[PDB]
Amino acid sequence: MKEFYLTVEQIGDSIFERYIDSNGRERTREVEYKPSLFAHCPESQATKYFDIYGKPCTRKLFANMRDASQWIKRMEDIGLEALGMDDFKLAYLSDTYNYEIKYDHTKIRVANFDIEVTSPDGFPEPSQAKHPIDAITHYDSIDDRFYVFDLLNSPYGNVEEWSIEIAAKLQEQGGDEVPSEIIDKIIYMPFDNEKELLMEYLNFWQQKTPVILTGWNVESFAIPYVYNRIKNIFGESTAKRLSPHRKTRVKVIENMYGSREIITLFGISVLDYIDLYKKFSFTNQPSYSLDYISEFELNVGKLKYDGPISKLRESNHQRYISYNIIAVYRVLQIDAKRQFINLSLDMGYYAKIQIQSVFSPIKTWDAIIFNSLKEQNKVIPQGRSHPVQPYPGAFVKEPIPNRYKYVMSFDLTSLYPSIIRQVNISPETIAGTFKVAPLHDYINAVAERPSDVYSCSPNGMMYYKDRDGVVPTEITKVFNQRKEHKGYMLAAQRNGEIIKEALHNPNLSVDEPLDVDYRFDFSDEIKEKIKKLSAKSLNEMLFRAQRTEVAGMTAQINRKLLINSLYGALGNVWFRYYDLRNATAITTFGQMALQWIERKVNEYLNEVCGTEGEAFVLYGDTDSIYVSADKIIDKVGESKFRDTNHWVDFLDKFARERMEPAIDRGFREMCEYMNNKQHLMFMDREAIAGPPLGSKGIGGFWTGKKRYALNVWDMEGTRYAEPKLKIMGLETQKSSTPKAVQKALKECIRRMLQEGEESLQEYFKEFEKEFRQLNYISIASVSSANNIAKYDVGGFPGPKCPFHIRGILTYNRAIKGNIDAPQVVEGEKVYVLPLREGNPFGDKCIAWPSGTEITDLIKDDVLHWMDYTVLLEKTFIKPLEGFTSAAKLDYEKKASLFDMF
DNA sequence: ACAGGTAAGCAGTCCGCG
DNA sequence: GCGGACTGCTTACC
Ligand SMILES: Cc1cn([C@H]2C[C@H](O)[C@@H](COP(=O)(O)OP(=O)(O)OP(=O)(O)O)O2)c(=O)[nH]c1=O
Ligand SMILES: [Ca+2]
Numbered sequence A: 001m002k003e004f005y006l007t008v009e010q011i012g013d014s015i016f017e018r019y020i021d022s023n024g025r026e027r028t029r030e031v032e033y034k035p036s037l038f039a040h041c042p043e044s045q046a047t048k049y050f051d052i053y054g055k056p057c058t059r060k061l062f063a064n065m066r067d068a069s070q071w072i073k074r075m076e077d078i079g080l081e082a083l084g085m086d087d088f089k090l091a092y093l094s095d096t097y098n099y100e101i102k103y104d105h106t107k108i109r110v111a112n113f114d115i116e117v118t119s120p121d122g123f124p125e126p127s128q129a130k131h132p133i134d135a136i137t138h139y140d141s142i143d144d145r146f147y148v149f150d151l152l153n154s155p156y157g158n159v160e161e162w163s164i165e166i167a168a169k170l171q172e173q174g175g176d177e178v179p180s181e182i183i184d185k186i187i188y189m190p191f192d193n194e195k196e197l198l199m200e201y202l203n204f205w206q207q208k209t210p211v212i213l214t215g216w217n218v219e220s221f222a223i224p225y226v227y228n229r230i231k232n233i234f235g236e237s238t239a240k241r242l243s244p245h246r247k248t249r250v251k252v253i254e255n256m257y258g259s260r261e262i263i264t265l266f267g268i269s270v271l272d273y274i275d276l277y278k279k280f281s282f283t284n285q286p287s288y289s290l291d292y293i294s295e296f297e298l299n300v301g302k303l304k305y306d307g308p309i310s311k312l313r314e315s316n317h318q319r320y321i322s323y324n325i326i327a328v329y330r331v332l333q334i335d336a337k338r339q340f341i342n343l344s345l346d347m348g349y350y351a352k353i354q355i356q357s358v359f360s361p362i363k364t365w366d367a368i369i370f371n372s373l374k375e376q377n378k379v380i381p382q383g384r385s386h387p388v389q390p391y392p393g394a395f396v397k398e399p400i401p402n403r404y405k406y407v408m409s410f411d412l413t414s415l416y417p418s419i420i421r422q423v424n425i426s427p428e429t430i431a432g433t434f435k436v437a438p439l440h441d442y443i444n445a446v447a448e449r450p451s452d453v454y455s456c457s458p459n460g461m462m463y464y465k466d467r468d469g470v471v472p473t474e475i476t477k478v479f480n481q482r483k484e485h486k487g488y489m490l491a492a493q494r495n496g497e498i499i500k501e502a503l504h505n506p507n508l509s510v511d512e513p514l515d516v517d518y519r520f521d522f523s524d525e526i527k528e529k530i531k532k533l534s535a536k537s538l539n540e541m542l543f544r545a546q547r548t549e550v551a552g553m554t555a556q557i558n559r560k561l562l563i564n565s566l567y568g569a570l571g572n573v574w575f576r577y578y579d580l581r582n583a584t585a586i587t588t589f590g591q592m593a594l595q596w597i598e599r600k601v602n603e604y605l606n607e608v609c610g611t612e613g614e615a616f617v618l619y620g621d622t623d624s625i626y627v628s629a630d631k632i633i634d635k636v637g638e639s640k641f642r643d644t645n646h647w648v649d650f651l652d653k654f655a656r657e658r659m660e661p662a663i664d665r666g667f668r669e670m671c672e673y674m675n676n677k678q679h680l681m682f683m684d685r686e687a688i689a690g691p692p693l694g695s696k697g698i699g700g701f702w703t704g705k706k707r708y709a710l711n712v713w714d715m716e717g718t719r720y721a722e723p724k725l726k727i728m729g730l731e732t733q734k735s736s737t738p739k740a741v742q743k744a745l746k747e748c749i750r751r752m753l754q755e756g757e758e759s760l761q762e763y764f765k766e767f768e769k770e771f772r773q774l775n776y777i778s779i780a781s782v783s784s785a786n787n788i789a790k791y792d793v794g795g796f797p798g799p800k801c802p803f804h805i806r807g808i809l810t811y812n813r814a815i816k817g818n819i820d821a822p823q824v825v826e827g828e829k830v831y832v833l834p835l836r837e838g839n840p841f842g843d844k845c846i847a848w849p850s851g852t853e854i855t856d857l858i859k860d861d862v863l864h865w866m867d868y869t870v871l872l873e874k875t876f877i878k879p880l881e882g883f884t885s886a887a888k889l890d891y892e893k894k895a896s897l898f899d900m901f
Numbered sequence B: 001a002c003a004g005g006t007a008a009g010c011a012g013t014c015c016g017c018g
Numbered sequence C: 001g002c003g004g005a006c007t008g009c010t011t012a013c014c
């Protein structure tokens, strides 16, 4: 089979590669890569290498990478450009693998692990590595086994071996409840002492050397600690065994009152799962502990136990080890669902970069663009330095705060990416410029046509319509990929709504779920069978459908992230092809396009409907417009409408039959105006919102820019079984507003849109009345803790000290001394609560690490001095007042005027 | 260093106000 | 004895 790399590193004048050969065996080699750079030369001297702009270049082979590095320096010490790929690692791959890489993941060794360290002291700082490692669970994807390393003897207590039979029993039977599906894949290994533990671990690591190393927070804790622990004991010569090439690099970076350590192991690709989740999950969590995340993604338990984790191993060792095995497993479950590793490999092998580089859009695209240029024998430009500069972006229409019964939305596809393709924007397709007229002239189709021969943009740039352009081309490949995966996703969504509509006929029968591929729209034969299935079989299918959707989502939203990131890279000084002229061409064209079609859409509707000068487009943001469909329902009036689904199907057809075509002709015209390479401004219908038939609900409302809510019935072709709320920017969508309030505010909104003002007040009085009995954790607000020290001023708030920071300082003060209470980590999330006058803490609020309960020491005080009144006003009432106010409505009734009656 | 701009809402301060 | 006019900090929408 076609070969493919595993990892690659540059060490001195050599390149170290681990790869899979034609036979599927993992090999390693050390190459004295002879790099090759370029320099401009006289037009006469002819060759095959030309820079992206069409200039001749002479190629220079170098004895070794070191000589090529010194040549780039000498070249700058002179003032001449030094073209070519300066990152010799990438050049090496590009050379070694000149073909679309087809890899086999079953050959890639993905390791997953977690360790435990008892510490009565406090949190075992990896830099110090003072306490012993008493447990290690390491899962190997090739062997598909959990290798468990237990330390039975330690200065913190000796314990009896772990029992796998006990781990398997249910909690309720005094067991640990370790999943059945992995009990057989566990290899338990007890040890008399730490040295033998650590020593046996390293030999294991030698035999099963990880290619991809993942885990939860593994990069900032596990790895560092196991490195420094092995260092402080056997010496840095042994510790370096963790690297297959015996080479490590330790970067420091210490805070104002803390020491953090960054270890890099050459020959291994570390993908901390928390970093993968932060970048690809598209979520913003109140806490990032595995428990919180595990519950959010899998709906599993809280992994409970009694006492501090510091005393867990000593009092219930059986559970301690079982909990360590389960934690490692939970990450596997989350990944089996989100599939971030697969995504990483896909992106990695597509661009020919180190796998750990998928975190860098700039690196990713540099390699993609590079490889694409190599094929046409072109030479890439040299990276230059630039000063940062602000530049304009998208346009956002100021909405009129109010309610909106029926609303319909429209939106363009991969906007910026499409704009790049339509105008043919790229570092080498620049033709020139043109005197520009105020932006509103082009919108109003009044300004003179910029060019008759070139592709143009309202910002004054012109691009060749004839040529190709590596960016436009390379950006189209990834875009087509997204197209596909988005297809499978939306299908899984639709198939999913069917199963829900079917959960209304739960047939009293014993079954087994159908065997279908949820990536495709269910066929009639299937749609036929499902109607007869049981609530049991239907649910498993719903579950499988949703897991298919999530998998699709991951695949699609992240390819979208990538292409949108190429646009951003154009606006970043570190990008080899940085250029504000191109970035601005994109955003400016966007501002024009959005408003251009606003003018248009407002015409065709004022025309058709009949009225004149009536604003149908009530809002818009970057590439979307929300059109009011009241008059479109008025010209027919609530009449020939049997049930809600009636007019929803009505509007669906109106947009799909009339509105859209109009829009297509509106953008086709603009493409002509700007004389662009090709028309790709495709704007289709999005959401259809409004209240249920004959309801007291307002259907929707806006309060300001980026702040609105709508009761949607159909979204991009999916007809929900139950109306789904679409809220944007309101408190309900923010991680900082307490969970109880998000849930409560969302119910108020739901009642406010689906039902009338009566249901809202009814629920408002109810909530206000019960608010006091909610758990403290669910009514606490959340916030990140940045620059704590900065406003320290010796344990007290400083100048302009932030509420959450303040609340932290009061915390460290209430636990000051007894080093055992969890310390708030600089840069993490924290729960925050307001304290009434007279509290023993000496302040109006207190803060503590999120995803946790406050230390049992101060917990009862804070519970007693909680200012429920401020919490209700600030987090609930104030924002509620915002929604109802803008929507012309009241939550707490009003002066009946008929009072005394 | 390591995709980008737009915009809202909360507090903290400072300053005008019989 | 605050109101609002800025400013710093968060976090969401594109
Ligand atoms: C979400 C997002 C958008 N944008 C820009 C580029 C986008 O094309 C534009 C509009 O964003 P979106 O409408 O969110 O997305 P999209 O147009 O790219 O694609 P689609 O709706 O088909 O999924 O805003 C970014 O630069 N970065 C981002 O992270
Ligand atoms: Ca743990």
Ligand SMILES: [Ca+2]
Residues within 6 Å of the ligand: A411, A412, A413, A414, A415, A623
């Ligand atoms: Ca879009």
Ligand SMILES: [Ca+2]
Residues within 6 Å of the ligand: A411, A412, A413, A684, A686, A716
């Ligand atoms: Ca769409």
Ligand SMILES: [Ca+2]
Residues within 6 Å of the ligand: A411, A623, A624
């Ligand atoms: Ca959009």
